[PDB]
Amino acid sequence: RKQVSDGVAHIHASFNNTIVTITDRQGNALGWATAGGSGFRGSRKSTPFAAQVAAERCADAVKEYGIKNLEVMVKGPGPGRESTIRALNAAGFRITNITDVTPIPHNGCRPPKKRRV
Template structure:
């Protein structure tokens, strides 16, 4: 007996391609991870908040090559906001980017956090050549009212 195509209301069985889909594609989000070999220049985005520091290394088009945060390298709670944790996050992101061939980066720093300088230093110590450093912290032209001061 020939297989009947499901009507629009019926669910497609798992693992079978959708009608009209190319053979070999099962229509999920699975698949191979894209490898980015030979990316030599990039941008290191350092977002340093009062609670955490996130280091994202992208190629020149903005496609993410590697990233790390103080939380992903093992720090929890208040220790995530320390300069040491920011340095470890930068170290981890730089190591991952170097494995993919990254040699030099432009650094863009955003935010008021404590880990800004330490993250930049660790990117340099990890062997990445820093070509420029830019502060891209958004500054309001007297926009929203800031939160009220804490009374402890």
């Protein structure tokens, strides 16, 4: 019941899952979505056409205000960097600026050895 009018939307695009939260201008949570919470779980998610149905779920929780326009914050790789923005363009929302906020360091921390099969 605040009517933020316009607020950026963060798209935490990951591999094992993807989640988009339609925060406000300053950066306050107004409504978040989630593939894991979008019916199918396990790992069936991930896929782009699976995240789209997730972020689209926001237009059902963050619609209580009246977002007439909004930007997009895509972070991290994975099947949900495009899908999300698309579903949002159809949901009825607008757009003000697309950008990738993926954490790309300068050889700072030393990543995990991991995987070796």
